[PDB]
């Protein structure tokens, strides 16, 4: 069946090589939007607003995007995708025809397999349930609100398909199974309503099993002989600088970000801290939710500015951990206590 994959392949590096061509001045845009498009964004600022907006979107939005994560890490190791930079220059399709140019970008190089697309399947979910969650509020010139939104979503799908296929990172296939999966993931999410009063235990056991299930299996697939580093030699000769290429030496940097996200949130609900100002409050009205959001925002953004060493893996993964498990619990917890502390007098 290899002919179906070249012909894929060859299609692919046809439309980078067409969009590399005729679109030249808008470089910085699709920058711009391959960068916006990462998922940091989604836990630091879409989160927060959300949560002190309608209390129950945040929840849903946080679950999509772990598990997402999740499926995407997981898929990974086994979907064995392959990048159009370092397919054009180390295949045979192109043996008695002239080779297509093909430009690299130092946000081009890549270490990770591109199958599964990790960036416009979290995006695609995350703006599916954003969208659905707002049609579902002002329920009771409806139709003239469907279409603008319907619209304003598919106009961000698909300029980070176009975003990821430009810096010749991804083929056409890859990322529309990506939107696909991503919008099935929040489809399937939106009919599971036990997510919402749930207890620390069930938060401990959901991470823990995730966890446990994630690391058996990548070690049965490393004791059977399955090769997983199998992209560290192709992004080392087929990149045009060898300074555009960052070696990775921490394989479960995200998997232990989702896990903490997922805990820290779980922490924050089931708290004392939360139950006082978030719920059952007597000063609660809209300009304390504006500055609760205002205050997260500010004070999330100038966090996120602690990068904890690499120098030693299990340092460098508890920390992450625990950073990651700090977001929830300062925008649910720490934050709108104070801020009910204060602006009560």
Known sequence: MEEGMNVLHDFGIQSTHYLQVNYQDSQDWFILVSVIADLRNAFYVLFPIWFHLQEAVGIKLLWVAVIGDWLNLVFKWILFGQRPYWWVLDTDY??????????????????????????????????????????????????????????????????????????????????????????????????????????????????????????????????????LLWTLEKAQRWCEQPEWVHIDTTPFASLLKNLGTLFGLGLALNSSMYRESCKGKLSKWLPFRLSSIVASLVLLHVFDSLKPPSQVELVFYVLSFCKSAVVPLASVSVIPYCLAQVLGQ
């Not at 975003?163 to 399937?188: C, D, K, M, N």
Request: hydrophobic share 50%; aromatic share 16%; net charge positive.
């Open 94 to 227: 192109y043996s008695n025809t002239s080779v297509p140019l093909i430009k690299q970008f130092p946000v081009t190089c890549e270490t990770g397999p591109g199958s599964p697309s990790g960036h416009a399947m979290g995006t695609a979910g995350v703006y599916y349930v954003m969208v659905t969650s707002t049609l579902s509020i002002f329920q009771g010139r409806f139709r003239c609100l469907n279409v603008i939104l319907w619209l304003g979503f598919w106009a961000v799908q698909l300029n980070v398909c176009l975003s990821r296929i430009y810096l010749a990172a991804h083929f056409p296939h890859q990322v529309v199974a990506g939107v696909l999966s991503g919008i099935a993931v929040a489809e399937t999410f939106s009919h599971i309503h036990s997510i919402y009063n749930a207890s620390l235990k069930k938060y401990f056991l959901i991470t823990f099993f995730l966890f446990s299930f994630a690391i058996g299996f990548y070690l049965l697939l490393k004791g059977l002989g399955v090769d």
